[PDB]
Design a binder for this molecule. Structure first.
Ligand SMILES: [Mg+2]
Ligand SMILES: [Mg+2]
Ligand SMILES: [Mg+2]
Ligand SMILES: [Mg+2]
Ligand SMILES: [Mg+2]
Lengths: 82, 58, 137
RNA sequence: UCUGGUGACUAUAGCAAGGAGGUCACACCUGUUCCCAUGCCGAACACAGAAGUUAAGCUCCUUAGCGUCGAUGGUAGUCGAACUUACGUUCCGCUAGAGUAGAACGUUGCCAGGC
RNA sequence: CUGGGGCGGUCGCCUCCUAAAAGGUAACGGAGGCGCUCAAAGGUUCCCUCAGAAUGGUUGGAAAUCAUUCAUAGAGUGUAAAGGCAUAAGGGAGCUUGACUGCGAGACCUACAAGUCGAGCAGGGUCGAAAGACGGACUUAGUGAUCCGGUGGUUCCGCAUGGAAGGGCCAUCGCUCAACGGAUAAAAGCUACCCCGGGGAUAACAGGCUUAUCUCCCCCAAGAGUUCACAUCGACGGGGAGGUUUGGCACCUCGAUGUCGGCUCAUCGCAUCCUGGGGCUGUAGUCGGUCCCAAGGGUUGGGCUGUUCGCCCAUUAAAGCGGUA
RNA sequence: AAUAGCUCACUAGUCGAGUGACACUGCGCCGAAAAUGUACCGGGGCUAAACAUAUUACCGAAGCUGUGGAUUGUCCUUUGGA
RNA sequence: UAUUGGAGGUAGAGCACUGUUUGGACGAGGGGCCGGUUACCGAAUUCAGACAAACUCCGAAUGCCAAUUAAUUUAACUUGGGAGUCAGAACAUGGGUGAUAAGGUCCGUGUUCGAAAGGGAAACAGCCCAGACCACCAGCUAAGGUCCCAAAAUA
RNA sequence: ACAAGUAGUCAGAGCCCGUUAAUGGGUGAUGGCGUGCCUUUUGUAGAAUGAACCGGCGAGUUACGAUUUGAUGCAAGGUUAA
């Protein structure tokens, strides 16, 4: 088994299950996380809030819709009619 | 209007996907057959697994 | 045309050698040129060597442009070692060629002299080649 | 469509260059007594005014020089298949990016006075 | 843990790539950080915009400060990296303590224990004119179960009864337990005197795959050789064949496949050492060199080392190279 | 060792039809040496019994049909057939 | 599966950022010297070229999440009783490691073997075709084939 | 007594015999197919292990308690222990 040859990079962290958590078109209850992120890949929109961890959660019950903000950003919305 | 589908090739050695599709069409064993109505939903499944089945206008 | 003066990361995943030339498929600087028809990794010692051959024949008459630069480093493990224990150290610098890539350009010299020079370069080189002129029309 | 607010839209909306203009609206202006204005400036900010002045900010019109938008077709890649071990080949879908024509010197709701 | 052990390295957390455009994903794979820091680098209210560049100058090591038009942020964000950020999350300034108490519909993660995000409802605040915003630092590391012991509340229990000693509950403290899910409060070695139970799950021998190394062959032809690439030799480079070396892999064999030299006996390949046939030559013949065809036969005796090998002394026409566990 | 220089720069005429080069391809050739015995088609053997492009037959399985038979399940009651 | 809606940055491209790079313009700094001239050399600024797992102004195919919803199929979940499994293997394909070595090693995605008989591949767990309830001296075919060994074309 | 054999099966002539009479028994020229069994394994005809051959013996039971299922009483009650 070789001998003394050793490497200084065998370390990593535990991945965080970030990304999307709900899709366009499903009924989310209020509080449902829609998109765990870092920084702002998606800003909150209508009836959506920003956690301390940049998490996005619905304010109220309703359907979820991802949309465009300006030329190159995205927000999120929730609408209650159900 | 109405078409006829027969499983001409076996399903052994094919991904689960293709076997599930074949299950969805309601075909059981090799050379089994069914008659269904022409429908874009059904054509979607025939086209996906055309290499295992064959069609007829019956 | 030997080595990159500095690279950020020095132990890089080896290059893909399957597909077609992303670019450099035309004579832009020269009059006659030389493209490749297979793919291989071309090392710095081979380029230097094909160059000396080409330019000894032209007898310092006309100009030369090397179109391939050895960017990728490659590693080789030390001799008689087992598998494992890290990645080896850099042994040379390479630049992948794939069918279509022009490797050498020349100008300011007659056609037959250029063809002879590029021929002599072709043999110091590990890839099948082809003689080409400045595309026009 | 004027003119000034205030939403809406991926700059096709923008930058520049040129040309106008003031319909009393806008500015620039003219001052510090006051509320206020600081660190470091009446600049700014706040305020008190209107003698001035289209000069600029602004608005309207021109122009694709720049930025932006951008197909058709072809190509790369690739799902599936059938060959095959070739730095592969074929068939069938999907189908870029770059580039080319071109688009384009915005539309636009509401509110108030205009005409 | 380990491409057999040993030696070296590592062990828990965070970030990035490998990771194949959800998530996840391994190697003793490629790169770095953490075991903190901030009473302002927290909350809120109101303000402000940057690095660099030239048109440049009292200094001008150049650029310190100052000036002016462009500066898409090329700057800053306490720190690693990655996502973010002019709504500013960046920079000031003024108040301030929400770096609250009791909780939490719902959701994410996930074997478990844990971890993460929360609208909203009370209590009592802060800042703001208000709307509001505030349960710590732009986000993500900066940590450690239980048992036990200490400290402060509570006044729950407290062995006939009243106290009390002791417990319970809530708050908190004491771990490089870093081998970081922590065997104990407390722990290093040699066995060639070894033993037992096991394994070809795993090494030494050869068998097998590979051919980096190794032997041989080739291709191009700068060149040396008076002249002349190509009698001979051929640099820089490039392409192969073989399975004889040093290895890599761990596939058969550990309920045993004796391993090195020598002796006896060989047998087969030919990339031929001699002998036979030739092309050549920088071959006048003897001489030698080179290449081709050729495996029929032949291919010594000793000194020195356990040596294979190698050197040496005498010969020979020659004293061949390998396979065969 | 000065050099001895005929022939494909070049065509009448020996005489009279053709003859350099270039690409891009389809199939072969050489490079090509290993150890018990052919021994890199399974053997014989094959100039098609190889290859390419079409077309038409046929063989070929415990696949799938045909007939008979178990044993379970779901339906009709066809208390029997499916 | 058909139709909508969406998250994400791979293949490919591209150089707008971090860099890595080959030629050509163009003025200029320390400096050849007397602050110097000219060569240059360190860059500024351009035009044409290229390279990238840890570059991205861009950006598929496909996968994934979900729907007012269709069409075809027949599972799915909850609770309880009983387990075995924690040595995998080879092929194909995307990657790391090694040497674009291995019947190597470590991942992803199928299939098969494991736990699978039968036909083809001479023989040959993993390849191709195909899943054996039990007869039958019936028939049709898949992969492979049709001169003889050896069923079928000396088509 | 010209033959290449995990010793069978399947197809079958010839030759003898005649039953638990049934589409019968013994042998088998010759053809087709076909590398024991166990264990252990990713994978074994394995040259991995185990057994010379026959016979006998030779391994999840019992006590107490829990949990779950079936059964049976009787049920807001059910049941006894010494
Ligand atoms: Mg022992
Ligand atoms: Mg034994
Ligand atoms: Mg045995
Ligand atoms: Mg034996
Ligand atoms: Mg025995």
């Amino acid at each position: 088994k070789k001998g003394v040859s050793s490497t200084k990079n065998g370390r990593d962290s535990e991945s965080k299950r970030l990304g999307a958590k709900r899709a366009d078109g499903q009924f989310v209850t209020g509080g449902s996380i829609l998109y765990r992120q870092r920084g702002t890949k998606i800003y909150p929109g209508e009836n959506v809030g920003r956690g301390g961890d940049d998490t996005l959660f619905a304010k109220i019950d309703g359907v979820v819709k991802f949309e465009r903000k300006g030329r190159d950003k995205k927000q999120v919305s929730v609408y209650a009619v159900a | 209007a109405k078409l006829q589908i027969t499983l001409t090739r076996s399903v052994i050695g094919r991904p689960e996907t293709q076997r599930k599709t074949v299950e969805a069409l309601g075909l059981k064993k090799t050379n089994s057959s069914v008659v269904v109505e022409d429908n874009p939903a059904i054509r979607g499944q025939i086209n996906k697994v055309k290499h295992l089945v064959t069609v007829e206008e019956k | 045309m030997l080595l990159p003066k500095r690279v950020k990361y020095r132990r890089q995943h080896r290059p893909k050698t399957t597909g077609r030339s992303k670019g450099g498929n035309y004579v832009t600087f020269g009059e006659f040129g030389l493209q490749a028809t297979t793919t291989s990794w071309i090392t710095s010692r081979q380029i230097e060597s094909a160059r000396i051959a080409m330019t000894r024949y032209m007898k310092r008459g006309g100009k030369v442009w090397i179109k391939i630069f050895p960017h990728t480093p490659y590693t080789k493990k030390p001799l008689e070692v087992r598998m494992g224990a890290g990645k080896g150290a850099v042994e040379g610098w390479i630049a992948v060629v794939k069918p279509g890539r022009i490797l050498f350009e020349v100008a300011g010299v007659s056609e037959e002299v250029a063809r002879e020079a590029l021929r002599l370069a072709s043999h110091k080189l590990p890839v099948k080649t082809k003689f080409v002129k400045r595309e026009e029309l």
